[PDB]
Protein backbone atom coordinates (compact mmCIF):
# COMPACT_ATOMS: atom_id res chain seq x y z
CA UNK A 1 0.00 0.00 0.00
CA UNK A 2 1.33 3.38 -1.12
CA UNK A 3 1.22 5.03 2.33
CA UNK A 4 1.91 1.77 4.17
CA UNK A 5 0.08 -1.55 4.49
CA UNK A 6 -1.04 -2.07 8.10
CA UNK A 7 -3.32 -5.05 7.43
CA UNK A 8 -0.58 -7.58 8.29
CA UNK A 9 0.47 -8.01 11.92
CA UNK A 10 3.39 -9.73 13.61
CA UNK A 11 4.37 -10.61 17.18
CA UNK A 12 7.42 -9.23 19.00
CA UNK A 13 7.52 -11.19 22.28
CA UNK A 14 5.86 -13.90 24.35
CA UNK A 15 6.15 -15.35 27.84
CA UNK A 16 8.55 -18.02 26.52
CA UNK A 17 9.45 -19.93 23.36
CA UNK A 18 7.07 -22.11 21.34
CA UNK A 19 7.04 -25.70 20.11
CA UNK A 20 7.03 -26.33 16.32
CA UNK A 21 3.84 -25.92 14.23
CA UNK A 22 2.00 -24.27 17.14
CA UNK A 23 -0.40 -21.34 16.74
CA UNK A 24 -0.54 -18.55 19.34
CA UNK A 25 -3.90 -17.06 18.44
CA UNK A 26 -4.45 -15.63 21.96
CA UNK A 27 -3.71 -11.91 22.34
CA UNK A 28 -3.50 -10.12 25.69
CA UNK A 29 -1.65 -7.33 27.48
CA UNK A 30 1.89 -8.39 28.39
CA UNK A 31 3.62 -7.29 31.60
CA UNK A 32 7.34 -7.38 32.41
CA UNK A 33 8.11 -9.82 35.21
CA UNK A 34 7.01 -8.37 38.54
CA UNK A 35 5.19 -5.05 38.01
CA UNK A 36 1.43 -5.36 38.68
CA UNK A 37 -0.05 -4.20 35.38
CA UNK A 38 -3.33 -5.18 33.74
CA UNK A 39 -6.26 -3.79 31.79
CA UNK A 40 -4.59 -0.95 29.87
CA UNK A 41 -1.16 -0.20 28.43
CA UNK A 42 1.59 2.00 29.85
CA UNK A 43 4.94 1.38 31.53
CA UNK A 44 6.29 -2.09 30.59
CA UNK A 45 2.87 -2.95 29.11
CA UNK A 46 1.91 -2.70 25.44
CA UNK A 47 0.01 -4.81 22.93
CA UNK A 48 2.29 -7.53 21.53
CA UNK A 49 1.08 -7.41 17.89
Amino acid at each position, epitope marked *: *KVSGNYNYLYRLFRKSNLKPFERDISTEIYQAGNKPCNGVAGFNCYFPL
Partner: antibody
Amino acid sequence: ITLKESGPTLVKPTQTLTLTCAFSGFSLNTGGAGVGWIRQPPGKALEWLALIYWDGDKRYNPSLKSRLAIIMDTSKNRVVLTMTNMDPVDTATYYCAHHKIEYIFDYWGQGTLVAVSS
Amino acid sequence: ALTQPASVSGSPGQSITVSCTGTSSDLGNFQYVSWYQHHPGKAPKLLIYEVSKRPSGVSNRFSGSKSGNTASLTISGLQAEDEADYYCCSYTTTTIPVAFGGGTKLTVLG
Protein backbone atom coordinates in the same frame (compact mmCIF):
# COMPACT_ATOMS: atom_id res chain seq x y z
CA ILE B 1 -13.45 -1.20 -20.81
CA THR B 2 -15.27 2.14 -20.45
CA LEU B 3 -14.76 4.93 -17.92
CA LYS B 4 -17.42 7.63 -17.59
CA GLU B 5 -16.70 10.91 -15.81
CA SER B 6 -19.42 13.31 -14.68
CA GLY B 7 -19.19 16.66 -12.92
CA PRO B 8 -20.60 20.19 -12.92
CA THR B 9 -19.60 22.81 -15.46
CA LEU B 10 -19.64 25.92 -13.24
CA VAL B 11 -19.75 25.92 -9.43
CA LYS B 12 -20.25 28.57 -6.77
CA PRO B 13 -17.22 29.72 -4.73
CA THR B 14 -18.87 28.37 -1.55
CA GLN B 15 -20.10 25.08 -3.06
CA THR B 16 -18.73 21.55 -2.78
CA LEU B 17 -17.67 19.52 -5.81
CA THR B 18 -19.32 16.11 -6.32
CA LEU B 19 -17.41 14.29 -9.07
CA THR B 20 -18.51 10.83 -10.18
CA CYS B 21 -16.74 8.20 -12.26
CA ALA B 22 -18.00 4.81 -13.41
CA PHE B 23 -15.91 1.86 -14.60
CA SER B 24 -17.14 -1.07 -16.69
CA GLY B 25 -15.08 -4.26 -16.67
CA PHE B 26 -12.20 -5.18 -14.37
CA SER B 27 -10.72 -8.21 -12.63
CA LEU B 28 -11.92 -7.29 -9.14
CA ASN B 29 -10.45 -10.51 -7.67
CA THR B 30 -7.05 -8.90 -7.13
CA GLY B 31 -4.89 -7.11 -4.60
CA GLY B 32 -3.47 -3.59 -4.86
CA ALA B 33 -5.61 -2.31 -7.72
CA GLY B 34 -8.09 0.50 -7.24
CA VAL B 35 -9.65 3.73 -8.47
CA GLY B 36 -7.73 7.01 -8.46
CA TRP B 37 -8.64 10.66 -8.97
CA ILE B 38 -6.17 13.20 -10.40
CA ARG B 39 -6.58 16.81 -11.51
CA GLN B 40 -4.68 19.53 -13.36
CA PRO B 41 -5.34 23.17 -14.25
CA PRO B 42 -4.09 24.81 -17.45
CA GLY B 43 -0.74 26.54 -17.11
CA LYS B 44 0.60 24.19 -14.42
CA ALA B 45 1.61 20.52 -14.47
CA LEU B 46 -0.16 17.45 -13.11
CA GLU B 47 -0.69 16.70 -9.43
CA TRP B 48 -2.33 13.68 -7.80
CA LEU B 49 -5.39 13.90 -5.54
CA ALA B 50 -6.61 10.54 -4.23
CA LEU B 51 -6.77 6.77 -4.62
CA ILE B 52 -9.03 4.06 -3.17
CA TYR B 53 -8.29 0.34 -2.94
CA TRP B 54 -10.91 -2.43 -3.00
CA ASP B 55 -10.67 -2.82 0.79
CA GLY B 56 -12.23 0.59 1.48
CA ASP B 57 -8.92 2.28 2.32
CA LYS B 58 -8.72 5.93 1.26
CA ARG B 59 -5.42 7.66 0.46
CA TYR B 60 -5.47 11.42 -0.16
CA ASN B 61 -2.65 13.88 -0.66
CA PRO B 62 -1.19 15.15 2.64
CA SER B 63 -2.49 18.30 4.39
CA LEU B 64 -5.80 17.89 2.49
CA LYS B 65 -7.45 15.30 4.76
CA SER B 66 -10.50 17.21 6.00
CA ARG B 67 -11.82 18.61 2.70
CA LEU B 68 -11.79 15.30 0.78
CA ALA B 69 -14.39 12.54 1.16
CA ILE B 70 -15.07 9.42 -0.90
CA ILE B 71 -18.33 7.52 -1.47
CA MET B 72 -17.58 3.96 -2.59
CA ASP B 73 -20.69 2.13 -3.75
CA THR B 74 -19.75 -1.52 -2.93
CA SER B 75 -21.77 -2.49 -6.01
CA LYS B 76 -19.12 -2.02 -8.78
CA ASN B 77 -21.05 0.88 -10.33
CA ARG B 78 -19.46 4.25 -9.54
CA VAL B 79 -17.08 6.10 -7.22
CA VAL B 80 -17.93 9.59 -5.92
CA LEU B 81 -15.43 12.21 -4.75
CA THR B 82 -16.93 15.01 -2.64
CA MET B 83 -14.57 17.90 -1.88
CA THR B 84 -15.69 20.82 0.28
CA ASN B 85 -14.54 24.46 0.57
CA MET B 86 -13.20 24.85 -2.95
CA ASP B 87 -10.56 27.39 -4.02
CA PRO B 88 -10.56 29.26 -7.38
CA VAL B 89 -7.08 27.84 -8.07
CA ASP B 90 -8.71 24.37 -8.11
CA THR B 91 -10.74 25.27 -11.23
CA ALA B 92 -9.30 22.47 -13.29
CA THR B 93 -9.92 19.27 -15.23
CA TYR B 94 -10.31 15.96 -13.42
CA TYR B 95 -9.38 12.45 -14.60
CA CYS B 96 -10.61 9.21 -13.02
CA ALA B 97 -8.26 6.29 -13.63
CA HIS B 98 -7.41 2.72 -12.67
CA HIS B 99 -4.48 2.37 -10.27
CA LYS B 100 -2.18 -0.61 -9.89
CA ILE B 101 1.30 -0.23 -8.36
CA GLU B 102 3.42 -0.98 -11.45
CA TYR B 103 1.04 0.77 -13.82
CA ILE B 104 0.73 3.96 -11.78
CA PHE B 105 -2.35 4.90 -13.81
CA ASP B 106 -3.13 2.08 -16.24
CA TYR B 107 -6.24 3.26 -18.10
CA TRP B 108 -7.31 6.90 -18.13
CA GLY B 109 -10.81 8.33 -18.34
CA GLN B 110 -11.94 11.32 -20.35
CA GLY B 111 -12.40 13.55 -17.31
CA THR B 112 -14.43 16.70 -16.77
CA LEU B 113 -13.43 20.35 -16.37
CA VAL B 114 -14.86 22.71 -13.75
CA ALA B 115 -14.60 26.45 -13.12
CA VAL B 116 -15.78 28.84 -10.42
CA SER B 117 -18.76 31.16 -10.95
CA SER B 118 -17.14 34.05 -9.06
CA ALA C 1 12.08 15.41 -6.42
CA LEU C 2 11.70 14.82 -10.16
CA THR C 3 12.58 17.10 -13.06
CA GLN C 4 12.78 17.14 -16.86
CA PRO C 5 13.38 19.80 -19.54
CA ALA C 6 10.40 22.05 -20.17
CA SER C 7 10.53 21.76 -23.97
CA VAL C 8 12.62 20.14 -26.69
CA SER C 9 12.82 20.49 -30.47
CA GLY C 10 14.69 18.98 -33.38
CA SER C 11 14.59 17.88 -36.98
CA PRO C 12 11.61 15.75 -38.06
CA GLY C 13 12.10 12.04 -38.56
CA GLN C 14 14.79 11.28 -35.97
CA SER C 15 17.25 12.77 -33.44
CA ILE C 16 15.24 13.24 -30.25
CA THR C 17 15.78 11.95 -26.70
CA VAL C 18 13.98 13.08 -23.52
CA SER C 19 15.27 12.51 -19.98
CA CYS C 20 14.22 12.86 -16.33
CA THR C 21 16.27 12.93 -13.14
CA GLY C 22 15.90 13.53 -9.42
CA THR C 23 17.57 13.67 -6.04
CA SER C 24 18.61 10.22 -4.80
CA SER C 25 17.76 10.99 -1.15
CA ASP C 26 14.11 11.68 -1.97
CA LEU C 27 14.04 8.85 -4.51
CA GLY C 28 13.20 5.47 -2.99
CA ASN C 29 15.74 3.19 -4.76
CA PHE C 30 14.34 4.18 -8.24
CA GLN C 31 11.91 1.44 -9.16
CA TYR C 32 8.56 1.61 -10.99
CA VAL C 33 8.99 4.82 -13.00
CA SER C 34 6.65 5.12 -15.98
CA TRP C 35 6.45 7.18 -19.17
CA TYR C 36 3.13 8.56 -20.44
CA GLN C 37 2.00 10.77 -23.33
CA HIS C 38 -0.67 13.48 -23.18
CA HIS C 39 -2.57 14.92 -26.13
CA PRO C 40 -4.49 18.23 -26.25
CA GLY C 41 -8.18 17.38 -26.08
CA LYS C 42 -7.58 13.62 -25.81
CA ALA C 43 -7.15 11.19 -22.93
CA PRO C 44 -3.56 10.35 -21.93
CA LYS C 45 -2.32 6.82 -22.53
CA LEU C 46 0.37 4.59 -21.05
CA LEU C 47 3.50 3.99 -23.12
CA ILE C 48 6.28 2.56 -20.90
CA TYR C 49 6.02 0.85 -17.51
CA GLU C 50 9.13 0.24 -15.31
CA VAL C 51 11.91 1.69 -17.48
CA SER C 52 12.34 -0.91 -20.23
CA LYS C 53 9.28 -3.18 -20.32
CA ARG C 54 7.00 -2.89 -23.35
CA PRO C 55 3.22 -3.16 -22.88
CA SER C 56 0.85 -4.38 -25.56
CA GLY C 57 -0.44 -2.03 -28.25
CA VAL C 58 2.67 0.15 -28.53
CA SER C 59 5.15 0.27 -31.40
CA ASN C 60 8.76 -0.91 -31.28
CA ARG C 61 10.12 2.58 -32.01
CA PHE C 62 9.56 3.68 -28.41
CA SER C 63 12.41 2.68 -26.10
CA GLY C 64 13.53 3.62 -22.62
CA SER C 65 16.64 3.18 -20.53
CA LYS C 66 17.98 4.37 -17.18
CA SER C 67 21.60 4.97 -16.17
CA GLY C 68 22.78 6.01 -12.71
CA ASN C 69 20.25 8.55 -11.47
CA THR C 70 18.86 9.61 -14.87
CA ALA C 71 16.18 7.87 -16.92
CA SER C 72 15.35 8.63 -20.54
CA LEU C 73 13.37 7.57 -23.59
CA THR C 74 14.13 7.60 -27.31
CA ILE C 75 11.84 7.36 -30.34
CA SER C 76 12.93 6.76 -33.94
CA GLY C 77 10.96 7.35 -37.12
CA LEU C 78 9.08 10.51 -36.19
CA GLN C 79 5.89 11.54 -37.99
CA ALA C 80 3.82 14.70 -38.45
CA GLU C 81 1.56 13.81 -35.48
CA ASP C 82 4.30 12.65 -33.08
CA GLU C 83 4.33 15.90 -31.09
CA ALA C 84 3.56 14.98 -27.51
CA ASP C 85 3.57 15.88 -23.81
CA TYR C 86 5.80 13.01 -22.59
CA TYR C 87 5.66 12.73 -18.79
CA CYS C 88 7.65 10.68 -16.28
CA CYS C 89 5.88 9.56 -13.10
CA SER C 90 7.69 8.00 -10.17
CA TYR C 91 7.64 7.18 -6.45
CA THR C 92 9.05 9.65 -3.90
CA THR C 93 9.10 8.40 -0.31
CA THR C 94 9.85 11.55 1.74
CA THR C 95 7.35 13.93 0.10
CA ILE C 96 3.98 13.09 -1.58
CA PRO C 97 4.29 9.40 -2.61
CA VAL C 98 3.88 10.03 -6.36
CA ALA C 99 5.63 12.63 -8.51
CA PHE C 100 4.53 13.69 -12.01
CA GLY C 101 7.20 15.17 -14.28
CA GLY C 102 7.96 18.82 -15.00
CA GLY C 103 6.08 19.38 -18.26
CA THR C 104 7.15 18.69 -21.85
CA LYS C 105 5.93 20.06 -25.18
CA LEU C 106 7.59 18.58 -28.26
CA THR C 107 7.45 20.67 -31.43
CA VAL C 108 8.47 19.92 -35.01
CA LEU C 109 10.13 21.96 -37.75
CA GLY C 110 8.22 20.53 -40.72
